[PDB]
Amino acid sequence: YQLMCYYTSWAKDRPIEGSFKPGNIDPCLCTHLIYAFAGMQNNEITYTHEQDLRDYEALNGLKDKNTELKTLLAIGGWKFGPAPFSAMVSTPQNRQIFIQSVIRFLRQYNFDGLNLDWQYPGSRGSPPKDKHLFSVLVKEMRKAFEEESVEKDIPRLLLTSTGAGIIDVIKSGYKIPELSQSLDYIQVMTYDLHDPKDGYTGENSPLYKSPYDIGKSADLNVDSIISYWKDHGAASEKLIVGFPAYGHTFILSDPSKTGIGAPTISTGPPGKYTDESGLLAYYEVCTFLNEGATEVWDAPQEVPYAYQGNEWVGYDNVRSFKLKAQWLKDNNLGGAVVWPLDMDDFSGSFCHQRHFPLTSTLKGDLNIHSASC
């Protein structure tokens, strides 16, 4: 099994006790470290900031401590959106400029591969033709990496992509059989399944549907999402299940109605460290519980939730990570990806469950072993 771990460039900019630097990642904790995010300029991959280069040296220097460790560079993300990718895949010339820039950039900065994180081909403004063009990009990039490997006699660069977790988005953006042929891994985005627009409390990443979920809401869970990817042709061993190290918050309409599917008014207030309305890092949820929130385990979805007054949070803990790890081995999946590693309790000071409680749970239950460690 693989245990991939995202490190976000903006984590070091948080208040000092909640900030995390790439050089402080345990080199033996994960099998792959993914740096989010690279930028794009003139159809070429580039760094978003000059300090990112210092982060690349620190992150890639962890490979001297674990010689089996692989590093990937992610490009895209939700805030980046689809427009730069739509323009880049539009012509063979633009795709070639991008592919050659990727090879030079990854080799220069000692990355082992690329994580395409287009959100998304075929939606958010990206036209229907991008479902085909993204597949053409992936196949051409895979071919170029194979040629580069043969010509330079070095191990081939890895090629991965995120895969949407929302069924409708999957249908309009992904040629699953073709992508599974050319990609080494697909990081399935089995998170942000809280459906904030519907007006009810929902879990960020439930393993199974709630007995009250109806229609498309009954597909907002790990089991349904991964089953859709496999039923439509993705290689089980190439699927990397997304494990969020955070939860989503809500303001309850009635502090007496605190279950899953309870009426809500809005997103909850931002946490002190992550500063994003509707989100709390796992370490911030630990503070929420420590200061008095009522913790509930939801067995039908196999995830926890917590509330205090009118604030409600749906999240993942050690038990939900353990149950999902057992489910992923039972389903013959390729492994897991922690999103983002910087929201797990990296210091051990917020949760009192040692360093990286969520990620360490996966390291143990997925039998992660490196001869270098």
Author numbering: 1 to 373
Quote the original article.
Ym1 (encoded by the Chil3 gene) and Ym2 (encoded by the Chil4 gene) are CLPs belonging to the glycoside hydrolase family 18 (GH18) and are unique to mice, with no known human orthologues. Ym1 and Ym2 are among the most strongly induced proteins in the airways of mice after allergen exposure and both proteins readily form pseudo-CLCs in vivo.
We produced recombinant Ym1 crystals which were shown to have identical crystal packing and structure by X-ray crystallography as in vivo native crystals derived from murine lung. Native in vivo isolated Ym1 crystals and recombinant Ym1 crystals as well as native in vivo isolated Ym2 crystals and recombinant Ym2 crystals were crystallographically equivalent, sharing the same monoclinic space group (P21) and unit-cell parameters.
